[PDB]
Amino acid sequence: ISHGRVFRRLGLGPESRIHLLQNLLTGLVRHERIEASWARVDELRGYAEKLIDYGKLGDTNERAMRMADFWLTEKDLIPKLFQVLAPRFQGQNGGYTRMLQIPNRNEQDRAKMAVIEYKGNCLPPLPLPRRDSNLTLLNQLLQGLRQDQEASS
């Protein structure tokens, strides 16, 4: 039984799985946003997060360097990881990746797809879900409650 397992089985086995994630991660560090299958984007999420946590460990750390070697296939990307992508995340602890669901693919396959993106990339802003504004009848109705809780205190 499946109880308490944090990994999907994707591709031809465990190795194939690691290499699928390798490709995706290279794609993500290169193009800064990619659109892939929802299972696989959601899988990539964790690794994309922690790869940036090695970037913060400094260029000089060896354990981070041989890690960046395995996980970034295109070699140009490695200086991009350390000098570009790591420094623009400093204050923010975990806030790196936006993952959102796209309409299902248009091919006869019809998979379930997601786009995954690093915060602060220079690309057109993704059409994020908007929150209802505060002039809304219900939200406007809550403001009264708030001001009354302020008036009672």
Binding site: E74, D76, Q83, V84, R88, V115, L123, P124, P125, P127
Partner: protein, 110 residues
């Protein structure tokens, strides 16, 4: 095992018209405030994501032209420009992509 008797059309109507084999009516459909097309509540708008996607493709082409070869990729942050725009000091020292289209309303200046 081979079926012992042809089934009647009655039995078949029972089986394959079951309320379970019928397609359920999706109740989460809404309209997108911009283009007014249909979208599901938890998913991005298709039509919006399209114009976003096209523009991303074109900006990636022009930044493919600004790069000489397959393995050569910039160490600076990139900032994309549109007709009539000049770089701020915050954004200078960075790679710059220049584009003909005047900056699209949904893409902000920041």
């Amino acid at each position: 095992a081979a079926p012992k008797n042809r089934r009647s059309i009655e039995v078949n109507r029972c089986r394959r018209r079951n309320p379970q084999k019928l397609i359920k009516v999706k109740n989460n459909i809404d309209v997108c405030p911009e283009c007014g097309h249909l979208k599901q509540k938890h998913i991005l708008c298709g039509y919006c994501y399209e114009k976003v996607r096209k523009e991303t493709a074109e900006i990636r082409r022009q930044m493919g032209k600004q790069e000489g070869g397959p393995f050569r990729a910039p160490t600076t942050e990139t900032v994309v420009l549109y007709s009539g725009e000049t770089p701020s000091e915050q954004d200078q020292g960075k790679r710059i992509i220049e584009r003909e289209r005047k900056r699209p309303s949904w893409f902000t200046q920041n």
